[PDB]
C-alpha cells in the first residue's frame, strides 16, 4: 500500500535529509510503501512555510514532517490543530500543550536545573539565543528567584557578524566587572563555536572557569581546543555511542560515501539527524500498527484547498494521532514514549564532562528521579 506524507527541510539540512533517506531505506516493510514529497524551503519566514504546508496538504497526505523556528511555530501549530493533520518534528518543544504535534527533542530545563543544583552555583552568566524559545530563560529566572540566585541574561542572538570582535570582547569585559567566572552557553551548534573561538582569543579558557553547553549535542561542536586549555566544562548528550545499536549505526554510517550522502565521513553525528531517524522509525512503527489494526484508514485524494472555510477534518486524523501517541519502540536516543499531549517521556539524558583525554560520562538524567 501507498501512504503519502510530507517533507519540509530548511536550507542547509543536507545531513538531516541524508539521515531521513537512510532511515527510509532501512525501515522497509511489505505492509506499506511510503512516498514522501520533500520540499526544501527555509523555515525562517512564514509566508513560504504556509505555502509549502498548503501545497503538501493539497495532495491529501496523512503525516507531515518538517522543522520550524521560534517565529514560524505558531502558524504551523495552528494549521496542524485546525485540519487535524498530525505533525512530527525533532526541533525544540512548543509552549504548553498542543494537539496533533509529536515532538522528538526532550526537555532540557529539568536537566539544566538538576546540573545547576548539583554543581551548587550561586552567581553565573547566562548566554541564550532567540531561536530556541524563551521558555528556558523564564524557567531559569523563576528558579533563581525561588532559590535566591544572582543570575544575568545577555542576548547574544542580535550580535551581527561584522562587529563580532568588538561586541563579544566588550560584553566579556563588562561581565568581568561582576567577577563572574561561571558561564552557561545556550545556543545552537553555530553560535557556540563562535563563543568558544572568542573565549580562546581573549584567553578565558584558563583553569578557573566552568562552562555549560545547554544543548542536546555536546560532542557535536569542536572540542579539540577547550580540552587542552584547563577549564573543565560540562554538557548534555542525548545519544550514547557505548550502545550496541548506536555503535552499529555509526559503523554503517561512516562507510557511506560523501558524494551521495553529504556529511557521512564523520565519527560523531548530529542529534537532529538522530532524532529524525528516530522519528522515521516511529512513523514506520505507527503505520505498521495501523495496517495491523485492520482499519480502513485510506481516504480519497479530494482534500482540496487548505484555507477552506469552514474546514471539516476527517476521523483518520485523530486516528493516526492516537496511533502516533500510543507508540513505543527503541531507537538511537534510547526508549521512545509519548504522553497524551505529545511530548517525550521516559527519556534518559546523559551528562558529559570534558577531560584531558576527552569527554567522560558522569551520570544520567530522567523525569522520574
Amino acid at each position, epitope marked *: 500500500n501507498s501512504i503519502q506524507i510530507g517533507g519540509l527541510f530548511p536550507r542547509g539540512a543536507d545531513q538531516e535529509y541524508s539521515a531521513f533517506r537512510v532511515g527510509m531505506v532501512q525501515f*522497509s516493510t511489505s505492509e506499506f510503501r511510503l512516498t514522501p514529497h520533500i520540499d526544501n524551503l527555509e523555515v525562517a519566514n512564514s509566508f513560504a512555510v504556509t505555502n509549502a504546508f498548503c501545497s503538501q496538504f493539497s495532495r491529501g497526505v496523512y503525516a507531515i514532517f518538517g522543522f520550524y523556528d521560534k517565529k514560524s511555530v505558531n502558524t504551523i501549530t495552528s494549521f496542524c490543530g485546525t485540519l487535524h493533520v498530525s505533525f512530527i518534528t525533532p526541533s525544540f518543544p512548543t509552549d504548553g500543550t498542543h494537539p496533533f504535534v509529536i515532538q522528538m527533542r526532550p526537555d532540557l530545563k529539568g536537566a539544566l536545573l538538576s546540573l545547576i543544583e548539583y554543581y551548587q552555583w550561586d552567581k553565573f552568566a547566562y548566554l541564550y539565543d532567540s531561536d530556541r524559545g524563551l521558555s528556558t530563560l523564564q524557567a531559569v529566572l523563576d528558579s533563581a528567584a525561588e532559590k535566591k540566585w544572582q543570575v544575568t541574561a545577555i542576548n547574544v542572538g542580535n550580535i551581527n557578524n561584522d562587529k563580532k570582535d568588538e561586541t563579544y570582547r566588550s560584553l566579556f569585559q563588562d561581565l568581568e566587572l561582576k567577577k563572574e567566572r561561571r558561564v552557561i552557553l545556550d545556543c545552537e551548534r553555530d553560535k557556540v563555536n563562535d563563543i568558544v573561538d572568542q573565549v580562546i582569543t581573549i584567553g578565558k579558557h584558563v583553569k578557573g572557569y566552568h562552562y555549560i553547553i545547554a544543548n542536546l549535542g555536546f560532542t557535536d561542536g569542536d572540542l579539540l581546543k577547550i580540552q587542552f586549555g584547563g577549564a573543565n566544562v560540562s554538557g548534555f548528550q542525548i545519544v550514547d555511542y557505548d550502545d550496541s545499536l548506536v555503535s552499529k549505526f555509526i559503523e554503517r554510517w561512516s562507510t557511506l560515501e560523501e558524494k551521495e550522502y553529504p556529511g557521512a565521513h564523520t565519527a560523531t553525528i548530529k542529534y537532529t539527524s538522530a532524532l529524525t531517524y528516530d522519528a522515521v522509525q516511529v512513523m514506520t512503527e505507527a503505520f505498521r500498527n495501523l495496517r495491523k489494526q485492520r482499519i480502513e484508514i485510506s481516504r480519497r485524494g479530494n482534500a482540496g484547498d487548505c484555507l477552506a472555510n469552514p474546514a471539516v477534518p476527517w476521523g483518520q486524523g485523530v486516528e493516526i494521532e492516537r496511533a502516533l501517541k500510543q507508540v513505543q519502540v527503541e531507537g538511537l536516543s534510547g526508549n521512545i514514549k509519548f504522553d497524551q499531549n505529545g511530548k517525550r517521556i521516559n527519556y534518559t539524558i546523559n551528562i558529559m564532562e570534558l577531560k584531558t583525554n576527552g569527554p567522560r560520562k558522569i551520570g544520567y538524567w530522567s523525569e522520574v528521579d
Partner: antibody
Amino acid sequence: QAQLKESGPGLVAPSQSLSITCTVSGFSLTNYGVHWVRQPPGKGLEWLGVIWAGGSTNYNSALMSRVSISKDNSKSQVFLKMNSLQTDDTVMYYCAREDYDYDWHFDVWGAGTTVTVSS
Amino acid sequence: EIQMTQTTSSLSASLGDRVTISCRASQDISNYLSWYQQKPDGTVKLLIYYTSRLHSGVPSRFSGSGSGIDYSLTINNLEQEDFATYFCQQGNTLPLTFGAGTKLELKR
C-alpha cells in the same frame, strides 16, 4: 562502489524450479533492500518480487503462487527460487536494489542472467 | 495497479536532434516516475529521478518534465551512445510495474 552479479543455470527442463542467486557486492545485505524483476524478450520488464531488508517480501499479484525469494545475510545472496516454471519462461532475470533520492529510483542495477526453460 | 504504457513503440532520428519519448499512466503517480536507459548488451542505469531530476553520473543533456498522469522525457542533443532503449518505472503503488519503453536508433 556497489554491484550485483546474478547467477543461474541457463537451461532447465519444464515443470522444474528456477533458483537464481545474486551476490550483493559493494554494499550490505541487512541494511538496504533488494528486488527481483523479470524482463521478457522484447517486452516490458515486470516486477516479480522484492525481498525487503526487514525480512518480509512483496510478491506481485502475477506469479504469487509460483515465485518465492529467500534472503541470506551470511552469504550476502538473495536466492530467487521460481517454482512451477512455464514453457514461456525463456527470458532474462536481473536483480536490483532500491535507493532514496526523493523518489523510488533503483540506482544499483545488476547485469542479470538469462534462462532457457525448455524440456 | 498503475499500468504504465509507452505510446511510441519505436522512434529513430539522426544525430544532433532532440527526441521526446512519452509515457502514459493508468492513474495518478504523484510525479513518482523514473526514466532509465538500457543499452543493447543488458546493462541499465537510472537517468531520471522523480521525473524532474537527473541521477548522479547521467549526462547533462538528458532531461525530463511533466506532472499528473502524462509525462515525457526530452533529450538535448542525440549522440551515438544515446541511441538505445528507455524504460519507465512507476514506483508509486506496489507492485511497481515498469513500462515497455521505445528504442532510439540512427536514421539512414
